[PDB]
Design a protein around this ligand. Structure first.
Ligand code: 9ZK
Ligand code: ADP
Ligand code: ADP
Ligand code: ADP
Ligand code: ADP
Ligand code: ADP
Ligand code: MG
Ligand code: MG
Ligand code: MG
Ligand code: MG
Ligand code: MG
Lengths: 371, 371, 371, 371, 371
């Protein structure tokens, strides 16, 4: 019975049932359309490949995301993905379960609103709830206090929570995220002749990133050692068997998370952003935040990113403050896990917005909150 | 068995049992409410943190006092504190013990009245009595004659007693007290960039005051020496590890007790106030008052305040009169101790106002007196 | 001949000559540095655009203020601005005129001190004087009695003056100011998809604010009417021709001046702050303060802010007290005008601190006062 | 009932009925006219021998093709051949069946156009369709993905198809084909005195080619071994009983398919052409193309041509890519078979262009496509 | 004296002296080798025809470019061309002049690097500098602000510059260029029987393109009018006197610059690419970019391409933004002219990289920049 938990992210979709210890359906939020000789109808063929299908057929498809920086732009393709989950991956009659959805804070109200509408009308959902991803991530850690740094492909955001009592006043959001890192790699790999321009090629670059990139603890001295050939130089085999050799880029791309100016992102680096949000809060809180820096999301899966982070924050902070980062394994699922927790939680059941309530109240109901 | 003694002050609450040599429960009279995103209900959470709880969670709470200058303004929060004592700190069934309460002289009758009502009705107290704090302080000293200068956060007051036979005609009261000293520090620390504005921040300033402030024996020459860096300059570490450096303020704040004009308090300084109350009394008494100046209360815990006081009074008085100040250690508990004494005293048992008596007589009974 | 008057505010700089009926040089206190490909030297180019220059080139510059909440933090950029005025906007040999400077009360002494030093040493100023902005504002109104509420970008402050004889004891200062209003708009506009994050974008938001925001006389009922589309919904054209539509935000942002809790500013609203400062003063004064509430500063240029203010204070005050607000046109220049007045005033000439005096006395001289 | 399938190639004509497992009529696309003493009329005699007739009477006829490199040049002779099929070889009333025709890609539009016209007007065809030969060949193999290399007498061409979704963007065409191989033999046999110059003689050379030529796996070392007499030296008996002995030419002629420069064909060899078309496609596709190289057409009937091909492509490709060639028996009929398949296919019936449609629309209709 | 300016493009080479108002040597970057009977040695003959020589002898040569999409692939042939310029076309002792070279942005570092090496070692160049072509083009226009769209045979690229201060963050590059247009013509002319396959034939097609192709302002309606014979149908005489008639192709080929999907180029059209780069930049800049769209390069020499461009961008942009294209005559030389300007510029002389510096520093020096 129970409910569904759906991490409808900007990168990919993680869906499963509340109470599960992991998602059952994990696939990319991509819809692919035929590039050459536009479509054939009565043969079936197909012109809308989704997720792993799009991956399989990738070479001849135009890969589009529906989501841009946390915003659902292409609601039609979004709908297709929802359908694909419910009927192809989980294969369960939507209307039999409540649906827990998640989102990044500070989204345009229209996203929460219209998305809700669709769930109720198109999919006949019985009840649903929308939660902030960072909050859920904290639940997964089991801490009641800390800063949650959650970062994916569309956005990066920071939420500070103190023994419950989340502090809305200091929530921050950056457009700097995984897709920018990927784009930077396209630009940087160009230095060595490795031109990538199509959406299929973008995907390949992503694969590279996720396997070879790492965070240097000292980018300047990393670059210094990079003057000599070493373990930095690492091969990668393409889909067609050709081999790529990557050097400085292994960490120069991750560097942009601390040196955002590289891509024209005139803003603070992550470590600065974090530090600043601490400064924005009451001095009596700061201490506990320093010792409870929760990190989650796929873009925190770079080797040594936590260590680099700790180092940098320690430098910014007063020497007497203990800087400690909470960054368990399975950070990719942190949000989903948090969702499973709350959905299984007894108290939480009062939160469900039923379709009945929606119909009686209307759209605005999605912004309510109480526990 | 016996009774309870409760120093329900303006700063904090000191409670224990009659006959104890010290309070068992000592905590600040503060109720804290959530600043950000107003409260959550069914999770419990809590929206009313009291005393040390308020301290622990201070950063996200609005700290309010129920008492202003000795007057109970917020009876609801007052009630909460009473509850907290009885059930969380002492953890004793109120109705099993008589309760000795204390107050500053010249309060509005409604305080004594309504407070009494609550004790009898809400807490089902069996018997109670309200005493003047200064009087109790004298009992703690064990003297039968002297002037009691008792000063806390809300008020400062002077009572002169001569071999018993307290002299109501010359009781004096000032609004100048600990909270004004704290406020002055906020204003003075601003000179060095140390801005404090929230109630949490107020609390921090208090902590500073109580550790670093002292009374100069000669403020003018203290300021003279302050021209050069010295031991006057003293560091202080904040909750978040940042360090504050304080100089002149170490004593400039305490100076306001002798130079009240600094804060617009158009009145006499403490030493003058004392001297004047002596002048207000019969010349045959004056002598003994000069040699028995009892000092108590938390705002007399500044280093050298007694010595400064003695000096100043000596200057005002005739040279042949021996000026002697009685200022033992544990001045913070003087009143409470006095309460313990009388509550244990055999004779005193006749003073108890029983709920029965109250019910038979009514409110006005709280103003009776005889020994 | 005569002297110069310089309103070196937190927002912008208004400079002119004493005796002028208006500033000759009005431009923002901003220094802009090249974002992309850090600078070119021998071509000149320029890497320090100031004021209107920074505005013109805004898109590719990092806009920084030197002043934060009334405090000069970046003295180098501050110096650049001073230079720009004297040599580019007024184009007058600094050393030929005395300089009247202004500041918010309760600043760290180091500001007045170091600023003075620079004027004398770097710019070879002959004589100078520093005055409190609120005081000057009163002079512009021509009243001898009233409360001056002056509010800009960095700070908001309240000074009460009674027939001269300014009352230092009740001067109040808030960090809540124009920059917070702007930041709140960034956060609130996000609700509609209008993301602004760069310093260039901040500037755009400011422009919006200053043209479309207004104060509702009843925010609750304003929000009620806001349920329906109306004149509340107002278009705005961006620099690139795109059009923005703004609704509730038109007044929800101004609301924070009365409901500071919206941004976590745990303090009183303006109307409360004012009322409280009146309560802090002697009851014989209060009457005249009620009938003489002087309002000035750029953040008082919201439509209906005076009317809203009057309403709220009237509610707080006793019904028999006549609440009257003094809020002429040209409130933006009130301080500067006051400066012109005093600088032209005969009596006032004795106030000038000459460089000679400074050299003979030293820094501390800047805190003298007598008329 | 059903329809007809006609492989009207550049070499010969293969006709049969849809659903047949083989053509019923297979004969060369040749029209022969009397060389000596131009024709006799009223005796009948005949001056237009077609196909096998032309073969039988070959010695005294001028053999002409109507098709040159896939283009129909002599429409009159073309018409004669169509007639011969329908009335002499299949012997079926044209108008009773739909006709599936085939062609090489990138033909001049006029071929498809005018040919269509003739079918409808001269032969009163009810419905027809024109398909690309390579595509049909793939259908015969039954694969959904692969590269089809189809090569006959007039042209050689390459089409890459990926799970349907044929990729028009990388279709390639070469003039290098069977007729060039034949011409090269005429030139090479001349080295040994074997002069062939007439069209009858050309035909003989073709016969030789098709029986004795083979592809060496290593032409250089084949030539090395050719220094000694061996099995390379092979006899051939002419129509008049004379015997020809052929040596190096057995494989030197086939070599031109990999070494086209031999005949001045300044272009890539077949293996290079294939490889390049793979390079022209998306890297995500390349893999499957490598493992699915479909080969068809009469000029792929040389012994060992597949093995030689595989070898060469393997050399060009990355070592990790599995190079596999699909080259079943009956490659000569692959296209025809594919035609039979689609014509029998249910879905495909919608493709038929009826004469009615043609009359209502006009010529341009022949370029439509949808499934 | 002075220096040399060399537009070593992907199409052709334009060389002259700094300060000249035009190139002195203009010829194609082609090396031709004998197709038939590979070479004769001691007779001289020649096997390496360059530029106009290759043109003259074209029929019997294999024409190869050294450059592919901006990348130097055949360094040997590249060297030959350099030689040909210096000793046959300009006929000047290389080592006597500094050499200004140009390139497309985002090239592999190895190009700049190795090319530099050769200049210094093989040709003993005294000093040299490498500049971005688009930047130079802007200098030729004389504007300080604008977008430079520069497009040749190998690449198309976009650089946006704002009052100097070039914006590296938004530089874009497309593989879509002149050679693709030529290839498309080969494919499209095939529709009418006009088969072109050799490198000599490629060259002929180029000649056609450059004389007859034009950009339609409305391709759909152009195609509509193309249904009737008109001025669209235009004759062309080949080298051997045969005449070609071209119709739709006159503009269908140019259409691919706006409809890149025609050749499988899954990317934005030029007008979209431009528009998008504007969107990528700060909103305060956008305005000036809209009104200053600089266009240069040989592939912008199609009739009406500017007008078509303007139309399309205007459609994409907001109606209030003035869209203006800067497209003077002599766009083919824009880059070269810019080079002449800077080389003659006094300030610029500091930019020269001397061989001495190179020897002392090494390869990496070529990536320095400052003015
Ligand atoms: C352009 C502009 C206003 C135009 C908005 C357009 C007219 O209306 C839209 O719809 C915009 C559309 C929209 C979508 C859906 C909807 O239901 C409602 C709005 N969100 C966006 O465009 C946002 C996109 C965005 C990125 N992170 C965000 C975070 C929150 C909100 C939006 C964004 N967005 C225009 C910008 O970010 C860009 C980039 C600025 C930050 C640098 N990366 N810059 C601006 O916005 C400023 C300049 C003003
Ligand atoms: N091993 C990895 N190393 C670094 N980054 C990764 C790794 N795996 C994933 N990522 C980044 O995280 C992105 C998605 O993670 P996620 O946070 O789940 O996105 P979203 O939450 O929007 O679905 C990936 O697409 C990639 O950009
Ligand atoms: N070490 C100290 N030095 C100076 N002042 C102190 C010290 N400790 C406490 N105080 C002052 O005394 C105040 C409270 O003392 P107390 O007289 O008990 O208040 P109350 O009697 O109203 O409860 C403190 O809050 C502070 O203002
Ligand atoms: N028309 C307006 N409406 C509302 N607020 C305004 C208006 N014009 C200016 N402001 C606010 O006043 C600010 C600056 O005014 P000012 O008081 O002069 O600042 P400062 O005194 O620090 O220079 C502006 O930057 C803006 O925040
Ligand atoms: N046994 C063979 N070996 C080699 N080549 C052959 C053989 N048989 C036929 N061919 C070549 O194939 C040519 C025709 O095959 P085909 O592809 O059917 O031509 P088309 O498809 O144009 O009708 C023959 O005429 C000959 O050139
Ligand atoms: N009249 C013309 N019309 C259209 N395109 C032309 C014309 N002349 C040249 N081109 C195109 O421009 C190409 C080369 O111009 P150019 O930009 O100088 O190349 P590159 O800069 O790489 O040397 C030509 O080879 C051709 O593709
Ligand atoms: Mg996520
Ligand atoms: Mg006390
Ligand atoms: Mg001001
Ligand atoms: Mg065939
Ligand atoms: Mg060029």
């Amino acid at each position: 019975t129970t409910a569904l938990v759906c991490d409808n992210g900007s990168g990919l979709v993680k869906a499963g049932f509340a109470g599960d210890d992991a998602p059952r359906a994990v696939f990319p939020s991509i819809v692919g359309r035929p590039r050459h000789q536009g479509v054939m109808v009565g043969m079936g063929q197909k012109d809308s490949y989704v997720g792993d299908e799009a991956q399989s057929k990738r070479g001849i498809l135009t890969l589009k995301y529906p989501i841009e920086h946390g915003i659902i732009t292409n609601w039609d393709d979004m709908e297709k993905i929802w359908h694909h989950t419910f009927y192809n991956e989980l294969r369960v009659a939507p209307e039999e379960h409540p649906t827990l959805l998640t989102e990044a804070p500070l989204n345009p109200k229209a996203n929460r609103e219209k998305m809700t509408q669709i769930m109720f009308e198109t999919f006949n959902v019985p009840a649903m709830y929308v939660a902030i991803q960072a909050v859920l991530s904290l639940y997964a850690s089991g801490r009641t206090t800390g800063i949650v740094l959650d970062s994916g492909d569309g956005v990066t955001h920071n939420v500070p929570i103190y023994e419950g009592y989340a502090l809305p006043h200091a929530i921050m959001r950056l457009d700097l995220a995984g897709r920018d890192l990927t784009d930077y790699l396209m630009k940087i790999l160009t230095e060595r002749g490795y031109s990538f321009v199509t959406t299929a090629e973008r995907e390949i670059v992503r694969d590279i990133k996720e396997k070879l990139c790492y965070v240097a603890l000292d980018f300047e001295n990393e670059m210094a050692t990079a003057a000599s050939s070493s373990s930095l130089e690492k091969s990668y085999e393409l889909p067609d068997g050709q081999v790529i050799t990557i050097g400085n880029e292994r960490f120069r791309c991750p560097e942009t998370l601390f040196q955002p100016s590289f891509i024209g992102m005139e803003s603070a680096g992550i470590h600065e952003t974090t530090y600043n949000s601490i400064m924005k809060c009451d001095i009596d809180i700061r201490k506990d935040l320093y010792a409870n820096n929760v990190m989650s999301g796929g873009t925190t899966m770079y080797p040594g990113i936590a260590d680099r982070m700790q180092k940098e924050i320690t430098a910014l902070a007063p020497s007497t403050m203990k800087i400690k980062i909470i960054a368990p394994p399975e950070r990719k699922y942190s949000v989903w896990i948090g969702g499973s927790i709350l959905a299984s939680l007894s108290t939480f059941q009062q939160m469900w917005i039923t379709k009945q309530e929606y119909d009686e109240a209307g759209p605005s109901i999605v912004h309510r909150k109480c526990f």
